[PDB]
Design a protein around this ligand. Structure first.
Ligand SMILES: Nc1ncnc2c1ncn2[C@@H]1O[C@H](COP(=O)(O)OP(=O)(O)NP(=O)(O)O)[C@@H](O)[C@H]1O
Ligand SMILES: [Mg+2]
Length: 398
């Protein structure tokens, strides 16, 4: 945390680096202009990245960048797909302008698809940032229940993006619409997963009728990496449910070939390569990452800490329930709920409505005292926002 590496980037180059397993890396742009996944860097601002961060700082015009601290790897790459990503943004904006002159105008809807670790989340981040920098407010839709960049694992979620991502923390999640799926993969309950994203689409369609900026902002929709078997059919159903105009396939020629023959002819399908900077991650690291996501939901980040409450709740004061493949079941408080997330349902009653109701948020059950009929929960707020708690199979040791 003291030794220094200096890099000169020519136009259209990016510095790719990974922080050591053991320490922070601090990046500073010292000359020119640069961006990290679409967010512009401020000249001479010091950006501190935590252990194991994997980052690319790209420049359109040329830049000089300093890194302070131990890196596992740091090199300048001279060939990237960045112009491709920019041209996708450019095309979307063109569509917005055309529909604005025709008109309230509906923004383009883009579905990003492809297998795991082709940079789908990063590309969605770049596209959302570019939209924001264009003065638009797109809706980012997260359909990946495993690796979710909006809420905890086991959710389908959407958020109006009004500010570029923080280079370190990612997007500010200002009042997301969140549905509790309750599993880390769609395969655990396919019919529910489909019902949820269709409910999401319906909800969003009504929301944007009341908000013209969001309506023309359009949608950038991230799917999970499940592209084979039933995962393929989910992509097709998502494209239909969200009425997408554009499908971007990342690094999967077969999937691109299949969708070309299946999607309605009006849908523009674009195949794009993955960046050579994308890290291929193991199941083990993916699991640790879901864990860190849960931790972040309650405790926030090093930049912006959250201070969650720990208090006891009487089993007389709540109803516990679980979905599933369609039926709600009332759960009797038990030892087996310990370590599980529960969602605070927006439905006032534990009835048919829970299934299609969004949630206020989550709590984590840390202890269960069956004798006293109480549980200890970790919760974002001082009191529970709902008396209806919906089971999630996602567990976390805090
Ligand atoms: N051009 C790049 N240079 C360096 N690192 C990158 C680059 N693009 C992506 N990464 C990093 O590689 C990792 C994987 O990127 P990500 O966009 O999450 O892939 P993904 O396809 O969404 N993976 P998943 O959805 O979990 O199957 C993250 O740490 C990114 O920050
Ligand atoms: Mg992803």
């Amino acid at each position: 945390e003291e030794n220094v590496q200096e890099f000169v980037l020519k136009e259209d180059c990016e510095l790719r680096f990974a922080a050591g397993d053991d320490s922070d890396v601090c990046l500073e742009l010292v000359k020119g202009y640069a961006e990290i996944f679409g967010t512009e860097l401020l000249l001479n601002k010091k950006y501190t990245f935590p252990a194991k961060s994997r980052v690319a700082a790209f420049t359109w015009k040329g830049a000089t960048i300093e890194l302070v601290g131990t890196t596992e790897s740091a090199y300048v790459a001279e060939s990237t797909p960045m112009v491709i990503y920019l041209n996708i943004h450019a095309a979307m904006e063109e569509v917005r302008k055309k529909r604005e002159e025709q008109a309230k105008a509906k923004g383009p809807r883009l579905l990003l698809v492809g297998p795991t670790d082709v940079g789908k989340t990063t590309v969605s981040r770049i596209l959302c940032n570019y939209s924001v920098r264009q003065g638009r407010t797109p809706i980012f839709v997260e359909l990946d229940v495993g690796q979710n960049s909006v809420s905890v694992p086991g959710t389908v979620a959407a958020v109006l993006v009004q500010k570029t991502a923080d280079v370190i923390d990612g997007f500010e999640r200002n009042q997301p619409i969140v549905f509790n799926f309750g599993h880390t993969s769609p395969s655990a309950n396919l019919s529910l997963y489909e019902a949820l994203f269709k409910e999401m689409a319906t909800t969003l369609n009504a929301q944007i009728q009341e908000n013209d900026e969001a309506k023309i902002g359009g949608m950038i929709i991230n799917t999970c990496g499940w592209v084979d078997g039933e995962g393929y059919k989910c992509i097709v159903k998502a494209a239909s449910a969200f009425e997408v105009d554009v499908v971007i396939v990342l690094d999967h020629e077969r999937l691109y070939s299949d969708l070309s023959k299946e999607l309605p002819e009006f849908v523009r399908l674009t195949h794009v390569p993955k960046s050579g900077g994308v890290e291929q991650r193991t199941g083990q690291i993916r699991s640790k990452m879901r864990g860190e996501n849960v931790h972040r939901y309650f405790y926030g980040t090093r930049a912006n800490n959250l201070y969650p409450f720990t208090f006891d709740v009487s089993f007389d004061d709540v109803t516990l329930c679980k979905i599933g493949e369609t039926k709600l079941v009332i759960m009797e408080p038990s030892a087996d709920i310990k370590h599980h997330l529960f969602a605070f349902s927006r439905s006032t009653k534990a009835d048919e409505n829970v299934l299609k109701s969004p949630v206020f948020g989550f709590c984590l059950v840390t202890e269960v005292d069956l004798e006293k009929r109480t549980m200890s929960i970790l919760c974002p707020q001082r009191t529970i926002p709902s008396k209806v708690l919906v089971f999630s199979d996602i567990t976390h040791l805090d």
